[PDB]
């Protein structure tokens, strides 16, 4: 027996599968169980032998993909591709909710850097979604004392106390009095999607000289970051400005369209990293093209 567990951001599904079972068969069963149709955004995340977080290929069997061995196999049904604008592209409520929960968790886990002012505004939309309108009676002082509202990095510059924070969030909850639940989630996603680290797939790489760098893959192309600045790219490669991309084993090369510009060469720890980089490039480029036809 092959026990597998797939979690969405708010559901947990446990399946028994077979050695012949494909990721697509698992993917489609999760998808119709929760009733989602905007499937192009999503995938089945897992951790592999080496402790890398990657995505299941749906065309290959679940067993042939080096998934970490644990009695319940662990898959996270998650957004794998991110729209250029959530307002135009996330239609179903199930899609919007799953994006909202996933993005909020990443922000709360300090995986996406977020200024404190934006963080409190984000927290206010989250409480308007969960609690509905602030009501003077049923929401007496201290009603968010047990809610996880802000990322810890924001707390570490602790000019405010744990109670001063909640009072300022409370203030902004009041300003959202008319807002319905789904629109509250969408306003959260509208703000969150403009953070610089939002929707970026980060890969640890090195240049030819051995200097460590980051490689970002997002909806608009490729970015090179210095190892100690993951916010602002030092080189940017939008799709329209790339002549070709390539890899051979560990060596990866980006050639810009300029023609006088030199290629950018970087090196991955192993071939599977470069394969995963390219797969995300192909997925993001295709959605990019499909948005413009």
């Amino acid at each position: 027996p092959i026990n597998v567990r797939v979690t969405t951001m708010d559901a947990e599904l446990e399946f028994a599968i077979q050695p012949n079972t494909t990721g697509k068969q698992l993917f489609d069963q999760v998808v119709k169980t929760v009733g989602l149709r905007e499937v192009w955004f999503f995938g089945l995340q897992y951790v592999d032998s080496k402790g890398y977080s990657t995505w299941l290929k749906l065309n290959k069997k679940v067993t042939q993909q080096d998934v970490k061995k644990e009695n319940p196999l662990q898959f996270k049904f998650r957004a794998k591709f991110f729209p250029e604008d959530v307002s135009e592209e996330l239609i179903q409520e199930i899609t919007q909710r799953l994006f909202f929960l996933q993005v909020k968790e990443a922000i709360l886990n300090d995986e996406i850097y977020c200024p404190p002012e934006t963080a409190v505004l984000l927290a206010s939309y989250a409480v308007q979604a969960k609690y509905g309108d602030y009501n003077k009676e049923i929401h007496k002082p201290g009603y968010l004392a047990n809610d996880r509202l802000l990322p810890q990095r924001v707390l570490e510059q602790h000019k405010l106390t744990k109670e001063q924070w909640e009072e300022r969030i409370q203030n902004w909850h009041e300003e959202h009095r008319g807002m319905l639940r789904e629109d509250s989630m969408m306003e959260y996603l509208k703000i969150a999607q403009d953070l610089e680290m939002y929707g970026v797939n980060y890969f640890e790489i090195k240049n030819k000289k051995g200097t460590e760098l980051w490689l970002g893959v997002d909806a608009l192309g490729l970015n090179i970051y210095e190892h100690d600045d993951k916010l602002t790219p030092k080189i940017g490669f939008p799709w329209s400005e790339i002549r070709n991309i390539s890899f051979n084993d560990k060596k990866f090369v980006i050639k810009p369209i300029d023609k006088k510009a030199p290629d950018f060469v970087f090196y991955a720890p192993r071939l599977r990293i470069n394969k995963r980089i390219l797969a995300l490039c192909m997925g993001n480029h295709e959605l990019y093209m499909r948005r413009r036809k």
């Binding site: 708010d10 599904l13 446990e14 399946f15 599968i17 069963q29 169980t33």
Partner: peptide
């Protein structure tokens, strides 16, 4: 055909 069989669900609301 090797379809997965659901043996458990938890819904978190």
């Amino acid at each position: 055909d090797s379809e997965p069989v659901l043996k458990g669900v938890k819904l978190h609301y």
